[model samples]
Target: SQKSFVVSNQLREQQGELTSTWDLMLQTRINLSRSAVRMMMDSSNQQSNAKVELLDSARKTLAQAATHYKKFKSMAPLPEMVATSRNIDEKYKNYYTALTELIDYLDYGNTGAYFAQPTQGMQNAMGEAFAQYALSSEKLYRDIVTDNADDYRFAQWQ
Candidate 1:
C-alpha cells in the first residue's frame, strides 16, 4: 500500500538535479564577480555596464534552479520538506536580492561618484547573504535526506 520508496527515489533524483543547478549558478556568480572587480579596477567604461548584465544572467539561473526545487517538492510534499524548501528558498531569494543590490551599487558608485574602493557596506551585506544561502542550503539537503530516510526506512525495509 505504501509507496514511500518510489516517492523518495523520485525526490532524491529531483534534489540531485536541483543541487547541480544551484552549484552551477553559484560558481558562475563567483566567476562573474571576479571579472567585474577586475574590470572595475581597470576603469573600463563600456565593460562596467556589462557587469549588471552578467549579474542579471546569474539571477535568472538561480530562478531556474528554483523550478527544480518545485519539482522536488512535488515528489515528497511532506510538511518537513515543504518547510525546509521554503526556508532555503527564502535564503536564496535574499541572496539574489543582495547580489543585485551589490551589483547596482557598484554600477552607480563606479561612475565617478566615489573614487577608491567599493562600498564596504554593500559588499558585507552581500557576503552575509551568500553565507546564509550556502549554510541554509547545506542544512536543507541534510534535513531532506535525514527526514526522508527516517520516514521511509520502515516501509522500505519491510
Candidate 2:
C-alpha cells in the first residue's frame, strides 16, 4: 500500500538519523576520554593546551549530537514506536546531563592541577549514561527495522 510505502521510507530516514546521532555521540565520548587521559598522564607542561583543545572539540561534537537527536525527535513516530521513542528521549537526556557535568568539571572544577581523582566520579557517571543511551537507541533501531520489514512484507502481498 502507498501508506505502508510512506511509513517504510520514514522509518529508513529515521534510522539514518539515529545512526548519525550515535556516531556523533561516540566521537564525543572519544574526545572526552582522550582529553581526560591527556590530563592524567601527560606532564603539566604538556597537558594544558592539548586537553583544552580536545574538550572544545568534544563540546562541538556533543552539540551536533544534540541537533541530530532534535531532528529525529521532531519526526512523527508510528503508534507502535511512540513508547520506544519516549524511552530514547529520556535516556539521551540523562546522557547529555552526565556529559555536560563531566565537561564542566574538567573545564572549571579541576583547573589548577591535573589531579585524576576529582573527576573520576563524573567520568564514571558519563560512561554509564552513554551505555544506557546506546542501549535505548539500539532498541529503537531494532523496532524501526522490524516495522520496516513488516511493511515490506505487506507491500509484497499487495
Candidate 3:
C-alpha cells in the first residue's frame, strides 16, 4: 500500500497549505510574544503594537485549527484524497468546528482591541487563546492516532 501510493498535486498542495498554516500559527505565537515584550520594554512603541497580540492570537488560532485539518488529512486512505479543500473528514469535523467557532469569536472581539489596550489584558487574552490552541490540537492528534491505529493494522494485514 505504501509503495503504491502516489499523492496527486492537488491533494499535496492542499495538505501542503495545511502544513504552512500550522507553521505560521506556531511562528506567529513566537512573533507576538517577542513584539509584546519589546513594546512593554519601550512603552513609546505601544501605538504600533496595536493588536499585535490580538492578531497574533488569531493567527495562532487559525494555525492550530489547520493542524486538525492536516491530521484529518493524514488518516485518509492514501489511494485517493478523501477530504476536499472545502470539506474535511466527518469524524473530526465537529472538533474542528468548535475551534473555528472560538476563533471566529476572537476575531470578532479582538479585531481592533489591540493597539493601546492594557498590556496585562491583552497578554491574558492571548494566553487563553494559546492554551486553547495547544489543547485542542493535542486532543485531535491523540484522537486521530487512536482512531487510525486500527486502520493501519488492517493495512498491515492486507
Candidate 4:
C-alpha cells in the first residue's frame, strides 16, 4: 500500500509539473509570436528591404507558435482547461507589464521603422497571456486532485 501510495503521488507530482510547464511554454511562445506580430503589423521599416523581412519573420513566428500550441491535443489532454485558461491570464500579466514602456517608446518619435507605440501592444500582449489564464480557470472549476487540502482551498487549485 505504501508503495502504491508513493507511486500515486509521484504520478500526481509529475502531472502537476508537466502540465504547469506545458502551459508556461505555450504561453511564452505565444507572447513572443504575438509581440512580433504587433511589431511587424505596422509600417515602420519602409526605407529598408529589411522591413518586409521583419514582417515576414513576425508572421512566420506567430504562425509557428500557433501551430505548435495546436499540437498539444495530439499528445494529451490538459486536465484543467478552465483554470489553465485563467492561469495563462495571470502569466501574461507580465507581458502587459512591459507594454507600457514599449508604448512610451512608440510615442517618442518618428516611429517609421519600428514601434512608436509599442507599450500598449506589450500590454495587449500581456492581455493575451491573461486570456489564456482565463481559459485555465474553466478547467480548474471541477478539478479535485490536491496535494494539500488547506493549500488547495486557499489557492483554488483543487
Give me the candidate number with maximum lDDT. 2
How do all models score by TM-score? 0.50, 0.67, 0.31, 0.33
**How are the candidates ranked when ordered by TM-score, highest leading?**
2, 1, 4, 3
Q: Model 2, 157: alpha-carbon shift in Å?
A: 31
What is the per-residue lDDT of model 2 for residues 1-158, given as tens digits with 9 covering 90 to 100? 36665566666666666667767877887888778777776665666558889999989999998898888876677655566566666666766776776677678536344343344454455445445544654565566556654442211211
Ranking by lDDT: 2, 1, 3, 4
> Least lDDT summed over 10 consecutive residues: which range in candidate 3?
149-158
Query: Model 3 misses residue 40 by how many Å?
Result: 2.1
Model 4, span 1-158: residue lDDT tens:
24333433433443344345445444444443344455445566544434334444434543443344344222332343435534444544454334323333333322442344344454455446545544444334334343322223222333
Which candidate has the top score in TM-score?
A: 2
Give lDDT: candidate 3, residue 27: 53
Q: In model 2, what lDDT does residue 149 have?
A: 44
Give the range where candidate 4 is weakest over 10 consecutive residues by summed lDDT: 148-157
Model 1 / residue 39 / CA error / Å: 2.5
Which wins on lDDT, candidate 1 or candidate 4? 1
The CA lDDT at 116 in model 4 is 43
As for candidate 2, its clashing pairs are: none
lDDT of 1 by residue, 1-158 (tens): 34554545554565575565456556545644654665565555655556666656655665665665566445544443554555555655565565555555445545343333344444444445445544554555566556654453211212
Tell how far residue 37 is off in model 3, in angstroms: 2.1
lDDT of 3 by residue, 41-131 (tens): 5456555455346555756655665674576355433322222322333323433443344344344443233333333443344344434
lDDT of each: 0.52, 0.66, 0.43, 0.41
